[PDB]
Design an enzyme around this catalytic site. Structure first.
Site: not given
Ligand SMILES: C[C@H]1O[C@H](O[C@H]2[C@H](O)[C@@H](O)[C@@H](O[C@H]3[C@H](O)[C@@H](O)[C@H](O)O[C@@H]3CO)O[C@@H]2CO)[C@H](O)[C@@H](O)[C@@H]1N[C@H]1C=C(CO)[C@@H](O[C@H]2O[C@H](CO)[C@@H](O[C@H]3O[C@H](CO)[C@@H](O[C@H]4O[C@H](CO)[C@@H](O[C@H]5O[C@H](C)[C@@H](N[C@H]6C=C(CO)[C@@H](O)[C@H](O)[C@H]6O)[C@H](O)[C@H]5O)[C@H](O)[C@H]4O)[C@H](O)[C@H]3O)[C@H](O)[C@H]2O)[C@H](O)[C@H]1O
Ligand SMILES: OC[C@H]1O[C@H](O[C@H]2[C@H](O)[C@@H](O)[C@@H](O)O[C@@H]2CO)[C@H](O)[C@@H](O)[C@@H]1O
Ligand SMILES: OC[C@H]1O[C@H](O[C@H]2[C@H](O)[C@@H](O)[C@@H](O)O[C@@H]2CO)[C@H](O)[C@@H](O)[C@@H]1O
Ligand code: CA
Ligand code: CA
Ligand code: CA
Ligand code: NA
Length: 481
Positions: A232, A262
């Site tokens: 990933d 990936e």
């Molecule tokens: C999906 C894909 O993304 C990337 O790709 C990019 C690319 O890089 C870019 O270039 C472009 O792409 C273009 C190409 O370049 C071009 O060539 C082409 O032509 O066009 C393209 C399109 O534009 O755009 C792409 C998309 O952006 C990347 O490179 C790829 O690798 C990636 N695919 C893989 C990678 C993944 C990552 O593992 C995976 O993503 C999945 O899963 C993700 C996780 O679920 C998800 O991420 C989204 O959602 C997250 C959760 O909502 C979010 O996180 C934010 O919010 C959190 C809060 O919910 C924050 O957490 C922190 O704060 C909280 C409050 C804390 N929690 C506390 C508090 C509580 C409350 O009381 C408690 O209950 C808890 O217990 C506590 O812990 C927490 O601890 C804190 O850490 C966090 O900090 C925030 O970041 C993400 O931000 C959001 O993105 C993805 O949506 C989903 O796709 C892919 O599946 C995998 O395949």
């Protein structure tokens, strides 16, 4: 002989904890259809029970401990997972585990950390002075304790975050300050430095971190009996780290672990750079091909099918390309939505499954469907293609990507596979025919369309040529069945 992997999950599967069981019981069926390897969804505890797994909380909790308000993961318990793996192994199917090492989400607690904000469009440019933020960087794993591993995470194991719990400002990226703290290199250069993606970004510069992830990789492999990995977000991870992590795991286990990374960017050049920097020690998903297929399916027949493979990894570096049509990010409503249209999907699968180059993959969402978004199961249209790959797609390949609508290619077969050989012909527009060479030794054979789209037969002439036909916006795969 032809290998075919399957991504055994889709983003919107129900949070019923019965996926491992579904995989378990589907093992024999998959093998019978031509599936030789399965890429399983993240097997560890996510930020919550219904997390797909990429919100990776604890890599040592495979649905075994009471953490995040649940023992099981979205997919099931560790026991059910291990039962599924055994079922796959007993049916001669290889198992590839997903691997998330870029970040950690769902931290147990926050910590006061010194940091500076950076420009989201250029993470190499600091936009504020240094100040204290409250970041989610502390992991103690209260439900697991020290079982399997006593390693605990703190802010110094990370390079930054995108959320300051004390101010809760949006659109910010925080780079931690401290001895030796800086974005990792080398990583993709979009946005200046693409090390940061989401959650708490792991610092690959920290020796303790490198040591720990390597040890986890070995534990993960030995615990489940994995045959390979689906890695990933590699463009956000120090390139040399991934290269050396793979080498370390292979060496420590004495197993030639398969690995597909990936690197999500529709840019062959960037992917080539990644391959060279990782010493060509593993494969990568053919992202450019996915976009070509996608764009072709959205062009209503005006896509120039002659260019379907231009700029793709499978065309340039076939040995290191894992070809796929769609995945959990490209499916409807997801982050990288670019779903290949249903009418074109069979052509896309023919393009990946019946050609000699590349390691093809079948997407669970396409095979069984995505009910939440109205996507019907397409296994009825995919199975005939899988059978073509399993029994007929062998031998020398002759290309006929010579028309803007109707393209095709043949396989002359080999003696290793009975009656092997085929003639794939497709059109993203009006139907038609094309003369193609299948081999003089096939003269007189009466071929038929394994997809069933065309009901007649094609008799190979004395010189090894057949006049193959195809319907509009469809694909036919003629074989000597
Ligand atoms: C999906 C894909 O993304 C990337 O790709 C990019 C690319 O890089 C870019 O270039 C472009 O792409 C273009 C190409 O370049 C071009 O060539 C082409 O032509 O066009 C393209 C399109 O534009 O755009 C792409 C998309 O952006 C990347 O490179 C790829 O690798 C990636 N695919 C893989 C990678 C993944 C990552 O593992 C995976 O993503 C999945 O899963 C993700 C996780 O679920 C998800 O991420 C989204 O959602 C997250 C959760 O909502 C979010 O996180 C934010 O919010 C959190 C809060 O919910 C924050 O957490 C922190 O704060 C909280 C409050 C804390 N929690 C506390 C508090 C509580 C409350 O009381 C408690 O209950 C808890 O217990 C506590 O812990 C927490 O601890 C804190 O850490 C966090 O900090 C925030 O970041 C993400 O931000 C959001 O993105 C993805 O949506 C989903 O796709 C892919 O599946 C995998 O395949
Ligand atoms: O005084 C805090 C201290 O925190 C960090 O040191 C960590 C170190 O990085 C870990 O590897 C481990 O040894 O725990 C230390 C904290 O006790 C910073 O790296 C360091 O600069 C800082 O002084
Ligand atoms: O290891 C360096 C190596 O890189 C290139 O070879 C690649 C080739 O380009 C790929 O298509 C595929 O075949 O993997 C090879 C690496 O095993 C260079 O072409 C080669 O000269 C160089 O030694
Ligand atoms: Ca770093
Ligand atoms: Ca990173
Ligand atoms: Ca066309
Ligand atoms: Na980092």
């Amino acid at each position: 002989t032809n290998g075919t992997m399957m991504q055994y999950f889709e983003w919107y599967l129900p949070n019923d904890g019965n996926h491992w069981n579904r995989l378990n019981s589907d093992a024999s069926n998959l093998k019978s259809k031509g599936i030789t390897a399965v890429w399983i969804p993240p097997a560890w505890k996510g930020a919550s029970q219904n997390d797909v797994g990429y919100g990776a909380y604890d890599l040592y909790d495979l649905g075994e401990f009471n953490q995040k308000g649940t023992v099981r993961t979205k997919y099931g318990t560790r026991s059910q997972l291990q039962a599924a793996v055994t079922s796959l192994k007993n049916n001669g199917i290889q198992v590839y585990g997903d691997v998330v090492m870029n970040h950690k989400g769902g931290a147990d607690a926050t910590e006061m950390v010194r940091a500076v904000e950076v420009n989201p469009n250029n993470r190499n440019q600091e936009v504020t002075g240094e100040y204290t933020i409250e970041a989610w960087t502390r992991f103690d794993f209260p439900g697991r304790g020290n079982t399997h591993s006593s390693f605990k995470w703190r802010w110094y194991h990370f390079d930054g975050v995108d959320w300051d719990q004390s101010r809760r400002l949006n659109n910010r990226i925080y780079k931690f300050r401290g001895h030796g703290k800086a974005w990792d290199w080398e990583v993709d250069t979009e946005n200046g430095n693409y090390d940061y993606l989401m959650y708490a970004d792991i610092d690959m510069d920290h020796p303790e971190v490198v040591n720990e992830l390597r040890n986890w990789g070995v534990w993960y492999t030995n615990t489940l009996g994995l045959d390979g990995f689906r890695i990933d977000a590699v463009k956000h991870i120090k390139y040399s780290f991934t290269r050396d992590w793979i080498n370390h795991v292979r060496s420590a286990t004495g197993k030639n672990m398969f690995a597909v990374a990936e690197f999500w960017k529709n840019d062959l050049g960037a992917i080539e750079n990644y391959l060279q920097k990782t010493n060509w020690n593993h494969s990568v998903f053919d992202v450019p091909l996915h976009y070509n297929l996608y764009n072709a399916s959205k062009s209503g027949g005006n896509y120039d099918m002659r260019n379907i493979f231009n700029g793709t990894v499978v065309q340039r570096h076939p040995s290191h390309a894992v070809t796929f049509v769609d995945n959990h990010d490209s499916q409807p409503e997801e982050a990288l939505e670019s779903f290949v249209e249903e009418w074109f999907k069979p052509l896309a699968y023919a393009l990946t499954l019946t050609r000699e180059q590349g390691y093809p993959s079948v997407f669970y969402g396409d095979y069984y469907g995505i009910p939440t978004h109205g996507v019907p199961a397409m296994r009825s249209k995919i199975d005939p293609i899988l059978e073509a790959r399993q029994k007929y797609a062998y031998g020398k390949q002759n290309d006929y990507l010579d028309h803007h609508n109707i393209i095709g290619w043949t396989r002359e077969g080999n003696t290793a596979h009975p009656n092997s050989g085929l003639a794939t012909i497709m059109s993203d527009g009006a139907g038609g025919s094309k003369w193609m060479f299948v081999g003089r030794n096939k003269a007189g054979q009466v071929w038929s369309d394994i997809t069933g789209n065309r009901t007649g037969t094609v008799t190979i002439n004395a010189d090894g040529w057949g006049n193959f036909s195809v319907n509009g916006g469809s694909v036919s795969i003629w074989v000597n069945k």
